Design a protein around this ligand. Structure first.
Ligand SMILES: Cc1ccc([N+](=O)O)c(OC(=O)C2CCC2)c1
Ligand SMILES: Cc1ccc([N+](=O)O)c(OC(=O)C2CCC2)c1
Ligand SMILES: [Cl-]
Ligand SMILES: [Cl-]
Lengths: 9, 236, 236, 9
């Protein structure tokens, strides 16, 4: 189950 | 104020360079320095702060999961005694992860949230607060696991209440908040039915609002909607 | 002796765990602590030392190249002035990289190389010495670029002389040394013809010795031979 | 041009 990746601006 | 002698604008410029160089620890330190200048953050600056710490804690969480899995295999029937090293090293990584989460939570509490008056900024920071309490909850085991879980829930809930009043159902921050709160329900709170209901209702209300969007906004919103769908497919 | 209170065997165990967790800075610190116990390193332990620092410096080199490219674009005709930040940050990364290279070179000099009597260990450490001087040469610009280049060349040459006398032409350490010395010739020493000649002769002499190998050794040697071939294809 | 990757034990 994935949260927002959020690792690239 | 370890970054106290550097200009705010230079810290932001260096955070962008650190992102390009994939130096996320540096990026987080630059953005922490920028927050500590005491001024509010713009939309782009909030994204830089979030990207930096998400990469730092993401690496720590991945390492913690590797070590926790090795440790659990060592504490099984038929396992040769390996000494204290696996536990000691998992504990070291866990403490480092907790320290990063505490640092982020401290920035939000001093004083990003209290100065955030617009819905976009307040929801963003409260989502961050829920996320970093959720990361603390992933490793918690003692007298405060329940309190950590409730702190995550409370932050997500306040963000949800604001987002439902102040943002359209396709707003990417509202969508990502709902996505992450649904993950909280499924993975942390042992509430898979609540996770599924939230993901379904969020997806359906966004679908009905897509007609109002430009092509670029449509792409932004549908990308996050697909993540909701991906989770629903895994959960049902 | 920051790791001075931990058992040698525990440092090695933790280095292996750090590798599995992709925590290469930790891995390097554990292996540095193990070296500083003062005992010679086994074949497996040498590999752990090399893997740890290769990952650390590899990340630094990749970041330095990103920042150096941005800096060179900023110092071009028609480029808006961006202030000192790109140069300052490239310099910070460069200094950190140099510090890691100096740390590795210091371990080799105190006292890994002097205690290394067998060909496998001595060639391994001299190859490492050439590699870390080569990384220093990649960023060098001042009064000592020539001396840094000569230090890399001298270390590689001593390793080559030993490897040709003491190891078969398919030995993976001998093959990797020749590969990296050829890269030194091409990328550092402005000697592409020497790079090509070394890669060709190394490949051909290994090919003629493959018949002596077991299936597992054949796989090890041919993997590195393919890297020589890959470079020859790019260079010719 | 590639040196030995050498990043996995
Ligand atoms: C919580 C959240 C929700 C939606 C996002 N979104 O992509 O719109 C988002 O941002 C990202 O995914 C990364 C790009 C900047 C950070 C973050
Ligand atoms: C200099 C060199 C040459 C050949 C190698 N080889 O693969 O045999 C080698 O080792 C590796 O590539 C990594 C696996 C352990 C480190 C290193
Ligand atoms: Cl430890
Ligand atoms: Cl800097």
């Amino acid at each position: 189950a994935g949260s927002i990746p959020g690792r690239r601006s | 104020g370890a970054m106290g002698s550097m200009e705010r604008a230079s810290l932001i410029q260096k955070a962008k360079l650190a992102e390009q160089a994939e130096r996320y620890e540096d990026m987080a330190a630059f953005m922490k320095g920028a927050v500590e200048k005491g001024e509010e953050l713009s939309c782009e600056e909030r994204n830089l702060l979030s990207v930096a710490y998400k990469n730092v804690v993401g690496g720590q969480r991945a390492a913690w999961r590797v070590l926790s899995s090795i440790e659990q295999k060592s504490n099984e029937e038929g396992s040769e005694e390996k000494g204290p090293e696996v536990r000691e090293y998992r504990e070291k990584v866990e403490t480092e992860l907790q320290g990063v989460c505490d640092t982020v939570l401290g920035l939000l509490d001093s004083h990003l949230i209290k100065e955030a008056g617009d819905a976009e900024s307040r929801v963003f920071y409260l989502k961050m607060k829920g996320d970093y309490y959720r990361y603390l909850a992933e490793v918690a085991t003692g007298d405060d696991k329940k309190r950590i879980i409730d702190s995550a829930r409370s932050a997500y809930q306040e963000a949800m209440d604001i987002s439902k009043k102040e943002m359209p159902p396709t707003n990417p921050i509202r969508l990502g908040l709902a996505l992450n709160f649904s993950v909280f329900h499924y993975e942390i709170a042992n509430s898979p039915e609540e996770a599924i209901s939230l993901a379904k209702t969020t997806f359906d209300e966004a679908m009905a609002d897509l007609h109002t969007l430009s092509e670029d906004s449509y792409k932004d919103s549908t990308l996050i909607m697909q993540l909701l769908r991906d989770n629903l497919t895994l959960w049902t």
